[PDB]
């Protein structure tokens, strides 16, 4: 039982894929706890991206999604974090499979539409870097018992 | 040019939804200002149904918004108002035409899914009244003035 | 309260359209009682077009609907049958709605796709004409007290 | 018995909708006469909006479309024209109901994604004009008498 | 040339999943041959699920299932079988990919939404069981020289 | 950065399916470059097949595409003619995994629905022989520069 942080990112923004990428999750079972539509400030964005702090691209990409627009969720379930990766496809586009985010919509990787927590520890970072504890909404679903 | 607010109401969540509503949204072409999923408080429904402040419904009413979940949007764009109208359908879902929210999703007013504003002072005051000027979102559509 | 009797005709059938329209009325809320694909009985076409008993085009009417196949099914809801009417448009695709079964996939009067109950006497009729008692399933839906 | 032009003007290209509108064509069920994608030339513009020779807004609506491109399309059927009418919309998006084109993805008049032959006068106009005899296509569907 | 069984189960059914499994089938080009919502009876779900008569999850597995309700339906092409399996998933959702039922839909396996026949043995032994010989309609597709 | 001939077969443009093909290339943001509804020349289907030159089976399938009708389109992108082919499938329709458009639509080999091409040499001939170099749009995408 997890939460993952999926992240519409700019270009998914820009290409009007919010409501695509919501619908996906949403279809798919996992529990909606979080969603904001948000310009990130540079702090977040230096922090989310923490474990390329020193290396070259470094700047250009903080600057990209800073810049945003983004928008911002978190999804519950049974192996949600595994089930986003899913749900996105794999990093490159041109090697995400059909039915994928990422494989229905991207074609480079650093236009690939959207970010799935990779990892329990990502997930565990994410989801309380970007979200206040006050915008987690408590909530149950009535037909919750035929999903898992 | 106008902003209007539009609220996916319990219902609407406990179908799974939101992702269509917001899509339908999106694809329309109307530009996104802010959103967020929420659990409301019972003082910000009371504001929000302030027009039915003194009738037997209300009470019921105020309970069935603020035990939520909900979630909230604010949309932008020439005639934005008459737009949400358009995009949800009328009161009724039995009234509503095939192709509205309403009358693709709906069979009685006490479930009819989404709120749109109803009118410019409506706007205004919900516009306000559900999200704080931090959660409104400057950006630049790159393909904006090819929608108007 | 009501039951109304849906059923995808012929051409809706060879044209694939069957899981589209059972997808439509089950979006829209209404309540699955009964459904089966089957080569219908003369006898139970000539009943269903008992009002056109003494017509000219009766003859080639019966043999369009008996020669099959069809995909009959009761859907159960607050006003059921006008929605059906709703879902489906006008009897003639030129003057439906784009939105409507016909509006969206029905060209001419002839080949209309699909049949809706079109009064409470009719469904009454239409009901338990082209479904046993045995043949309605009772089963109560989780997420049905969101719908109405 | 008629054929209708119908156009995908330059926004609906810049916003991703060419495929949107042919398939929405196709499920209608009209038969599929001629298709191109072109930069049209500013003599065939300026003919097509010939009604339009003397007025203020002339000299742009026609660098608009000029400047292209566009989606070009025959569409064959019973009463083809009235039906392009349907689908698309009315003139101005505001005022278009929900499942028509500007219905679902316009917003502003000026920006209203397609053309669709508003009578059969201007349809055979239309078609001799911006198509050339050997682009129309003969073909018959096997599942068209299932249609008209 | 094969025939496969395909059955809705009740958690598919609770979440409104008829119409898109059937329309994944009609789509896909697989004929259609029976179908039917029912409530299905003890006897039959016993002898469906006779592999595992002797086991600890045998007694919750049937009353899950009898408890219904169930749709049913039987499909018919080349490598039908095999066909059923790809557009349905692997047994678990979380390792079924994006594009299948399971992959789009399903979240853990003991709700997994729809069954298809495993193989050619099973095919046979469940088609002969959930319908009776009265219930396959014979059709001709006018298309279906254009499949397969 | 290369362009990819894509080519709606006659099957898929008897089932209805161009819009549908059309729509999955423009969603994953390609840039289309060419488009036209033809009935091709046998001069240029034998062209077309030429690496089967010599075969037994090279009349029939040189006479199933002469006979037509088919959709040609052009898509350019960074790896487009491998995107192509991830949107496509694998060349028989039960070894496609769903996603795909074979794998959505197609049941055998001889009923693929569609062609792309296979490989950049492949690729260079058949984009100069559907098409003449008139017949290639030079356009620019406004939100082009978040695709890549």
Redesign the interface.
């Given at each position: 039982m997890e939460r993952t942080y999926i992240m519409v990112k700019?270009?998914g923004?820009?290409?009007?894929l919010?409501?695509?990428?919501?619908?996906?999750?949403?279809?798919?079972?996992?529990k909606?706890?979080?969603?904001?539509?948000?310009?990130p400030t540079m702090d977040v964005v230096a922090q989310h991206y923490c474990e390329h702090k020193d290396k070259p691209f470094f700047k250009d990409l903080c600057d990209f999604i800073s810049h945003?627009?983004v928008?911002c969720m978190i999804w519950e379930?049974?192996?949600a974090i595994?089930?986003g990766r899913?749900?996105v496809?794999l990093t490159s586009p041109?090697e995400?499979?059909?039915?994928?985010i990422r494989?229905?919509?991207?074609?480079?990787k650093?236009?690939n539409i959207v970010h799935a927590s990779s990892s329990a520890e990502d997930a565990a970072r994410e989801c309380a870097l970007w979200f206040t504890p006050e915008?987690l909404?408590?909530?149950e679903?009535?037909?919750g018992?035929?999903?898992?």
């Open positions: 700019p270009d923004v820009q290409r009007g919010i409501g695509e990428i919501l619908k996906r999750f949403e279809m798919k079972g996992l909606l706890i979080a969603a904001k539509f948000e310009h945003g627009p928008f379930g049974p192996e595994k089930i899913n749900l496809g041109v995400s499979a059909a039915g994928t494989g229905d919509f991207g074609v480079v650093n236009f915008q909404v408590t909530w679903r009535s037909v018992g035929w999903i898992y």
